[PDB]
Amino acid sequence: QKEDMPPEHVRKIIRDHGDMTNRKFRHDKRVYLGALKYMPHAVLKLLENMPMPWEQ
Amino acid sequence: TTVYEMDFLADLMDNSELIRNVTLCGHLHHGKTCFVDCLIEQTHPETEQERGVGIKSTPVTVVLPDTKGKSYLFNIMDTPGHVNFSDEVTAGLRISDGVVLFIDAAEGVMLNTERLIKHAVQERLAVTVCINKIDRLILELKLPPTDAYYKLRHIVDEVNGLISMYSTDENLILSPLLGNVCFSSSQYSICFTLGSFAKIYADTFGDINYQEFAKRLWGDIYFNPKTRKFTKKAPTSSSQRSFVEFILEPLYKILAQVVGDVDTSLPRTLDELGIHLTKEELKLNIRPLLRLVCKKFFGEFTGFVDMCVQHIPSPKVGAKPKIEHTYTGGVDSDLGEAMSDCDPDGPLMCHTTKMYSTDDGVQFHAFGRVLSGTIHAGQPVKVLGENYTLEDEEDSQICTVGRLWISVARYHIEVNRVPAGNWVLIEGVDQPIVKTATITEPRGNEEAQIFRPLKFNTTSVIKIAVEPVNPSELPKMLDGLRKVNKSYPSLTTKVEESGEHVILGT
Amino acid sequence: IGVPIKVLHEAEGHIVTCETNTGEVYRGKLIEAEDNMNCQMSNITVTYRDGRVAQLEQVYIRGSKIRFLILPDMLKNMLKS
Amino acid sequence: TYQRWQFTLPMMSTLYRLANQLLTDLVDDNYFYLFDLKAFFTSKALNMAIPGGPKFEPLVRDWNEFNDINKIIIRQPIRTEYKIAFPYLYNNLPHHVHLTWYHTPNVVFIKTEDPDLPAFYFDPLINPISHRHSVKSQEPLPDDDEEFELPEFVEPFLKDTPLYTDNTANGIALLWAPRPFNLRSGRTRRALDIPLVKNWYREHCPAGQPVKVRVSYQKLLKYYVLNALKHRPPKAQKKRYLFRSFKATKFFQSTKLDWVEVGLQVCRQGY
Amino acid sequence: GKSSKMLQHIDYRMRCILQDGRIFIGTFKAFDKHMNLILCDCDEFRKIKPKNSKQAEREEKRVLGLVLLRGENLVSMTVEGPPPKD
Amino acid sequence: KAHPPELKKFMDKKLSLKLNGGRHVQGILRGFDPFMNLVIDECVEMATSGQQNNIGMVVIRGNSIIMLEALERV
Amino acid sequence: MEPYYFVEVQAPADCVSAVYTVLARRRGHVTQDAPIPGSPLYTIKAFIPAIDSFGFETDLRTHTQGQAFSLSVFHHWQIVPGDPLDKSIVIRPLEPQPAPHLAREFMIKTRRRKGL
RNA sequence: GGUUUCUCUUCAGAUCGCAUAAAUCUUUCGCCUUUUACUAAAGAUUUCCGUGGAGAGGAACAACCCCAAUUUUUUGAGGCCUUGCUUUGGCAAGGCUA
Ligand SMILES: Nc1nc2c(ncn2[C@@H]2O[C@H](COP(=O)(O)OP(=O)(O)OP(=O)(O)O)[C@@H](O)[C@H]2O)c(=O)[nH]1
């Protein structure tokens, strides 16, 4: 099976990449761009899992 | 866009005192069709719909064992309860022998129930009553069992007073005590008479005689246990009547436990009542539960079969009180006697007062009860309409019999032959006839007469004029008006000189 | 409750024939037969074992003294048992 | 995986009582007499409007001798309610007309005021029977001294089970309860699928509202009707499975985060 | 414990000798706690029971058809027939 | 349990009844018992040879009650 | 002579007033109003001209939110209020007339319809 | 031998999923310079968001004392003879018992 990672793995990845202007990444550039086509799906999945005002 | 069983059915058919033909009548919504349907299921596990109102009546024949195991043949005319459609009631009445009033508990007597009662008395039929929807006193009104009994007894005495209004000699008054009354609630499978209740009581418990028991329950009788003997009032104890203490209290508690305690106490209450229920059936919603519990507890419908066996004349007795009113000769020298016999014999007399149309095409099915004789397919027959008088043979077309059918609610049972006493769907005597017709043997003579055309309870006073948009289309419209005249018993049509085709309805 | 007693209870309205403890055979349309098989019927035609005849407009048949009961073939068509 | 719930009636009754303000306080269908679907379908097919109901575009868009007004007997003016109640008698050219009628028996359920009075208990609002009639009757009543006696084992079929407990009036009140609350089990729904206000706008004669909100009521009824009408069945089928194809690859990982954290991630990535 | 003492060969053909002696061979319709027995397509034998009787094998035979007997007149049972496929 | 003899229909009437051992009598059925033992008055016995002995009222042996038939119509 | 209709309305304690109003608009003559003992509903009996009974039930149910529900049946004829033979009545062609002249109006209309 | 969970494979909405989106096409209608973006009716087809059916692997956890006088386990229906009928056997009757 596929086992889950600790949250700091992704938190660190995203923090590192910041906003892709540093030249270190610069191949992510084109994959980052290619993932645009699926961005309206991430938004739908985000908004339908909204947290419901009786929860913090 | 019943191989093994039809035979046995035919046996009861030929028997001619194993059968009873009844008409189910009553007010709007008072339960008839749900009773008939839940019963259709109890036998076969195998515009009206969309309006949710029954407009035209339906014939249903079924085999039901009564409280002794004796199978019977039942013919049921289930009729609309809407005041406007009493014409189908009168059809079913003239072709039927006794009448089951259905009366709603939380309503009682209202307009159509009263008028239908007057009608069946003046048509000289037997009167048996099912008080229906008694749960609307328990689950809906929540009446203490005593006051439920009050209202029940009130309903019964009022339908009594009403039959007193219209039948001079009180041979029969109504009381559950006699087999006159089922109490029921068609939705939950509850149908019982004092006989049936006492019978389950004894059949599970000790060896009490159920009939003496049955005869003790209704009517202000008490029970002091030390006496073990039932006595008109001598508890100043303030105790309940036997009817309460022995039928209303346990049924009330059955419901209360089911709708209340399904999770906590119902498994042990089922322990006591001897009803075993599986886990899945313990996992039901409450209305399916209720009907399951009550149906496992109460058996099929035995109160109905007992009432109908005991107080319906059964066409063999049947015909003689009938043919007086029906027939224009009544009983004189040839045919009154030949008929009143009811024997499969000779004359082959029949009275068809319904035209059930075949959804597809022009042809219809005539429908009625054969009084004397026996009819087989392919026979040639001579029909007489209402216009036909003894020396009017013009009205007497002649045809053959295409096929014969018996009716499950919306099922056809095609057959080879039908004896006297039974209802029948005839294919092929359709075109020559108008609203009411009667039939005799073809080209073989004895002589014929006709039963009086139907008298109706209502007078159609509402008047509606009709005309096609393209005057080219008049013949098709006239065929339409014929067809609707065939389907509807009281519909009047006329042609006003000033160019109108006019319809008279209620 | 007996399955044969139940078939007998059903036998009302049809023809029933009874061989008695003495061996006479009676035929008639059965009216009502109790659990104890006491068959109270009408129009019985009974032939005795030697050949003698007899008939009655009514008849009663004690239960424990019944030798056999044969009905018309209407029954041969309850099979669930 | 959180499908298929099963509850007890104490739960369901408390749930009902908490949800009491978002719910409709009627027990039957006679309220929506000329305001149900088939009434709105017929109204639409005939391009006539009900007082509080929606309007739509007309479904499609010479001489006559009946219509001669000198021949008419005008007593009471024929209204749109009549033409809709009896669409085949008050209507020429009815095409695609559904037939409304209902007389559904008036369900009479009285709510219990205080939890003290017994479950089964006579009430003021019920009309007092005080039945009176003629000489009642007499019958083949078996007077004793012939003989009779109950073979002394039998008792009223249930005797230690009392008439009611602390679960009865509630068990009954849940017998007429709007859709979710009159069940005891069922399948789990998605949160998007639960229209909590649908029964507010499906109601009839609001009597004293700003024209603003009356017009909004009837626009919502129009939407709801069209939804009911245009239901094309699922009609077709394939089930391609996207996040599974993604997670089965070496390029996507998985974890658990806080909804707010994922939201901020998504805004950064869209930017 | 087994309880099948009749319903095992029930629906089968069997010849039962009565406490009077007639050997009724038929298809068993039901057994009983009292020995209440029913047989469909029933024959009864009085003069002899044929087991390869060259001179005669089916004689002193009465047709019963549906033969319903009680338990008092029950004597002995044996298997005689295979169930009819009807 | 404790079924009643269904002889109220033959009750109040006269019947010709054979009791076991070649015994034949005729008398007016006035009652019975749960064991079917019936006291029927006006018993006149007709022996197999034809001897006629009117003994008055007597009971009918229920164990030995072979068969009675009503002497009249219903 | 015109027909009359016997109307029987089972309805709650509330809507009795609305039944009254509707019958007054349709020429009612309420006969009796009595509770249904054993249930919190009233029964109303009234008479009503068959001419006026067109849409009566629909208007009742509408005004009372489906609380009221009434059936109606032919019961007995009655003398229409007006003088059937009076040339001094002149009937405007479309509007409904007051009581004194329904008979003139009905006979004229029926003759212009069929009898001429 | 049970449920639950994961992975993998395959089959279906006829009133459903007690909820309801978008695109394409056809015909009318409305907006108006043009095209896109739109309007509102009918009709047809697709896509999407969910669900049902069938199986395989793995996983985890539960677990190998009194009774019979009308219907069967107390039944006192016992015996003999004379007559007759029968090829004999056998069978019909009455009588006597104690
Ligand atoms: N409370 C209660 N309601 C019932 C019961 N049985 C049926 N109903 C309801 O009563 C309504 C009457 O429906 P039908 O059974 O068709 O009554 P009906 O009298 O045949 O209808 P018409 O023939 O047109 O008069 C049904 O919708 C049922 O849901 C019952 O036992 N109790």
Ligand SMILES: [Mg+2]
């Ligand atoms: Mg009906």
Ligand SMILES: [Mg+2]
């Ligand atoms: Mg250009």
